[PDB]
Design a protein around this nucleic acid. Structure first.
Ligand SMILES: Nc1ncnc2c1ncn2[C@H]1C[C@H](O)[C@@H](COP(=O)(O)OP(=O)(O)OP(=O)(O)O)O1
Ligand SMILES: [Mn+2]
Ligand SMILES: [Mn+2]
Ligand SMILES: [Mn+2]
Length: 903
DNA sequence: GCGGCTGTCATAAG
DNA sequence: CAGCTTATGACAGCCGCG
């Protein structure tokens, strides 16, 4: 019933828009848009547009954009502010969509597709499309069909049709196990020559031209390659047919490293899933191949064939095509789980931007603020070139390296965005400055009150209070979105810890999984049905609850990402509202607030426990505080609480009814001190962490800033049935750690925290012995392969050459000659192993592409020349030393006098 | 050759 | 190629040390 855009795009002086009309049909437009911009003019003229400061502005309507832009560059040339939205696309969308956009995902065509290409030349360069495409699979979100385009004959041998029968069969029957969920959704069409396969696919693209285009590396491989294949075969003219408006630009991506090339398809918003996943997943991965991610997200089987990829088509065409089909399915499966494409749409439409602009926070917020001002008949200021100036950030406490038994943690709900709201920080809301005392003076309240009338930050900034700024206004609106999606995540998690509590003492029946929406706290009625439901169906509920929670993560964490990104924007030379005055006012106030509540909390409990001077808060990072409950429990005497929960219950009920009220008036004082607009410092209890009851076990430890581990029972209302290890900063959290060692180290920590000195030493003994028998992959270090060229001197290590680059250069030397082996790529990640003295390679180490197994051309020897001793001390012992040094423990009993004894 | 030390890098925590 | 700062540890190259 309401119209919304699908794409927008500016070519010369026409605007091209794909949109869905008021009925539901996809259409196109070609509009000669008349843009507007503004300039300062005096008071005597009757006007109705002001800039954000409230100065009057006059509006200029240009016939075309060619004019509208030329104006801008003659305006800066003279040096007078050319006000208004200069990104004509956005201004346009705002004009056409003077309302909140209530889009419908079922009318938006989302496609994803995988290309296969055979190449004995090694990797097929998408710029050169040297070889022929012999498989395309294209899923359409509206037809809900995998359209398979199979090539039969090519200069690399001819083959027979693919069979949906054999495909759907079991791997155990020789079939390919193509999921049945989709077997009836497959549209298969074989081709005799490439040119036919190609022309029919181009025609098909016309009939089902995609809005969102996706897949895995489709922006760096599948698109450029297919575009360039067609270029060289049909001429560029037909090649441009790939964009519903017939315009393509070779967009250059440059780093501080090099310069790759991508192709732009005007009229299609390309969201590559590898760029989606790297942005929104909040997980750093050792490898970003589809297999590795699939095994990770979907716990599916490592898609296994036989021989190399290059020969697969000749040798086994039936796996070839299925393995291309399944490839596409699992991208839709990771999206089913993660729901990134959804989020992208949610965010783009909220801002009224191009959908591919979600990757840019600066763009996003620029358009959010813009659309906000337009509504109030206000004019945005001009863009400006600023020198990059580094400024101060958050404050991290210096924690005494030590074990810590009973611990409880608190955290500020969106500290930075709250501070914008609390103090009223916005570009136009600025009131003036005052003589600033040292920051420590404001923490203790010793220094004088900043201003009686304005709202103040301890960096010497004053802000209005009667006026609502734009940034606080707009940040509140997106905060709320998080606050609520955060509510459905924690509830979906809460529900987890019933279903898990159920799986302890289950039932057996032939019941089906119960129908309830997991976004809300399970009620009394539902919970008791759970105590009788079968383990099979119960399992199929935890899965669903977990899938809802992951959907919870996605919407919340990424909106949290947006709000904080508004702060980062206030510090970005390219951001329209960049103003260090503002950004520092945020970070600084943030330091005061933290240290303030430390002092204060060190004052509340000391007066409560009787003690005079004790240091209760052991650590704090930006907004969080960690409190040592030892004196508290000791005050009541641990010889009370019957079980582990009884003292956990105790401390939650403690934090709730006693602590946060005392904090509440603590933070209230500071608001009054700083005469802020409204009080929005909210500290909520997160982790309740201790050791199990009646067991030798340390509970937790700090080894220094940003490196600590706790053993947690309750994490933000959500109460775990099994203790959950909360490890921040340590080697178990680093992607560069070998997978087997990550596992090893976490078990050491678990035992340390849960089972004491005894248990650890025992596991250390055992791990050491069964270390040499581990998978080589599971013990490799990982790392990014950057500036390979910078340090490559004739295929040999240059000066200051890092250890993993050395690894890489060794690889290249050893593989130099025959091309068929995997090449390492500038940018991607590599597995690194250390080699023993006098190995047949040049060096003391070897690297190769992560994910993959190393080539048989070199595998046999590597395994033989692996340096286990160095690898174990490098990756496992050294980091472990740290933990124990910190907790004041020994991972290995020191020798003594008693050792002189017969067992 | 070993041991601080600063610097490039990779990757974490906010 | 896509907001911000703060902070760690692995490692290479430099420098003092009978
Ligand atoms: N990715 C980021 N980009 C910019 N600033 C950040 C980022 N992460 C954290 N910060 C800053 C802003 C945060 O308010 C502050 C502490 O963040 P953190 O406690 O991790 O989340 P948060 O306080 O924004 O909300 P919440 O505590 O509800 O998760 O540090
Ligand atoms: Mn594939
Ligand atoms: Mn926080
Ligand atoms: Mn925090």
């Amino acid at each position: 019933m309401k119209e919304f855009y699908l794409t927008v795009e500016q070519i010369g002086d026409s605007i091209f828009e794909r949109y869905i009309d008021s009925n539901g049909r996809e259409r196109t437009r070609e509009v000669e848009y008349k843009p507007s911009l503004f300039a300062h003019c005096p008071e005597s003229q009757a006007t109705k547009y002001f800039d954000i400061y409230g100065k009057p502005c006059t509006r200029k309507l240009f016939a075309n954009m060619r004019d509208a832009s030329q104006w801008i560059k003659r305006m800066e040339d003279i040096g007078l502010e050319a006000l208004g939205m200069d990104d004509f696309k956005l201004a346009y969308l705002s004009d056409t969509y003077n309302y909140e956009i209530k889009y419908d995902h079922t009318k938006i065509r989302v496609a994803n597709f995988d290309i296969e290409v055979t190449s004995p030349d090694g990797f097929p360069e998408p710029s050169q499309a040297k070889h022929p495409i012999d498989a395309i699979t294209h899923y359409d979100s509206i037809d809900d069909r995998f359209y398979v385009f199979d090539l039969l004959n090519s200069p690399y041998g001819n083959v027979e049709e693919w069979s949906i029968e054999i495909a759907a069969k079991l791997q155990e029957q020789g079939g390919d196990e193509v999921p049945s969920e989709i077997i009836d959704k497959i549209i298969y069409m074989p081709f005799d020559n490439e040119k036919e396969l190609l022309m029919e696919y181009l025609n098909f693209w016309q009939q089902k031209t995609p809005v969102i285009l996706t897949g895995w590396n489709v922006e760096s491989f599948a698109i450029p390659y297919v575009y360039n294949r067609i270029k060289n075969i049909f001429g560029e003219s037909t090649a441009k047919r790939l964009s519903p408006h017939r315009k393509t630009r070779v967009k250059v991506i440059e780093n501080m490293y090099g310069s790759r090339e991508i192709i732009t398809l005007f009229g299609i918003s390309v969201l590559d899933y590898i760029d989606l996943y790297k942005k929104f997943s909040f997980t750093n991965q050792p490898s970003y191949s589809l297999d590795y991610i699939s095994e990770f997200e979907l716990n599916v089987g490592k898609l296994k064939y036989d021989g190399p990829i290059s020969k697969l088509r000749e040798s086994n065409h039936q796996r070839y095509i299925s393995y291309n089909i399944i490839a596409v399915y699992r991208v839709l499966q990771i999206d089913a789980k993660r729901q990134f494409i959804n989020l992208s749409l949610d965010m783009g439409y909220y801002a009224k931007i191009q959908i591919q602009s979600v990757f840019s926070p600066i763009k996003t917020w620029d358009a959010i603020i813009f659309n906000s001002l337009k509504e109030q008949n206000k004019v945005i200021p001009q863009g400006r070139s600023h020198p990059v100036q580094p400024y101060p950030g958050a404050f991290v406490k210096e924690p005494i390296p030590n074990r810590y038994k009973y611990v409880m943690s608190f955290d500020l709900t969106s500290l930075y965005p709250s501070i914008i709201r609390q103090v009223n920080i916005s570009p136009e809301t600025i009131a003036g400055t005052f003589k600033v005392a040292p920051l420590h003076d404001y923490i203790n309240a010793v220094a004088e009150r900043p201003s009686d009338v304005y709202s103040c930050s301890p960096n010497g900034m004053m802000y209005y209070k009667d006026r609502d700024g734009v940034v606080p206004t707009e940040i509140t609106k997106v905060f709320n979105q998080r606050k609520e999606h955060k509510g459905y995540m924690l509830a979906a998690q809460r529900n987890g810890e019933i279903i898990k509590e159920a799986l302890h003492n289950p039932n057996l029946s032939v019941d089906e999984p119960l129908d309830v929406d997991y976004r809300f706290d399970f009620s009394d009625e539902i919970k008791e049905k759970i105590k009788k439901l079968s383990a099979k169906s119960l399992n199929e509920m935890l899965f669903r609850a977990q899938r809802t929670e992951v959907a919870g993560m996605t919407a919340q964490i990424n909106r949290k990402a947006l709000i904080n990104s508004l702060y980062g924007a206030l510090g970005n030379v390219w951001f329209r509202y960049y103003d260090l005055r503002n950004a520092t006012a945020i970070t600084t106030f943030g330091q005061m607030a933290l240290q303030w509540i430390e002092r204060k909390v060190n004052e509340y409990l000391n007066e409560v426990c009787g003690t005079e001077g004790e240091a209760f808060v052991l650590y704090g990072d930006t907004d969080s505080i960690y409190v040592s409950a030892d004196k508290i429990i000791d005050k009541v005497g641990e010889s009370k609480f019957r079980d582990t929960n009884h003292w956990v219950d105790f401390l939650d009920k403690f934090a709730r009814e006693r602590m946060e009220p005392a904090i509440d008036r603590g933070f209230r004082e500071m608001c009054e001190y700083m005469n802020n607009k409204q009080h929005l410092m909210f500290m909520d209890r997160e982790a309740i962490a201790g050791p199990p009851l009646g067991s030798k076990g340390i509970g937790g430890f700090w080894t220094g800033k940003k490196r600590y581990a706790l053993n947690v029972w309750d994490m933000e209302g959500t109460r775990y049935a099994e203790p959950k290890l909360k490890i921040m900063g340590l080697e178990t959290q680093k992607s560069s750690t070998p997978k087997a060692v990550q596992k090893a180290l976490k078990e050491c920590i678990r035992r340390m925290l849960q089972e004491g000195e005894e248990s650890l030493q025992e596991y250390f003994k055992e791990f050491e012995k069964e270390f040499r028998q581990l998978n080589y992959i599971s013990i490799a270090s990982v790392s990014s392969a950057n500036n390979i060229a910078k340090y490559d001197v004739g295929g040999f290590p240059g000066p200051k050459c890092p250890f993993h680059i050395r690894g890489i250069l060794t690889y290249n030397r050893a593989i130099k000659g025959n091309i068929d082996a995997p090449q390492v790529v500038e940018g991607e990640k590599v597995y690194v192993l250390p080699l023993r003295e006098g190995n047949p390679f040049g060096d003391k180490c070897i690297a190769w592409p992560s994910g993959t197994e190393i080539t048989d051309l070199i595998k046999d020897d590597v395994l033989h020349w692996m340096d286990y001793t160095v690898l174990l001390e490098k990756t496992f012992i050294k980091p472990l030393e740290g933990f124990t040094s910190a907790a004041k423990l020994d991972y290995e009993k020191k020798a003594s006098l008693f050792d002189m004894f017969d067992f």
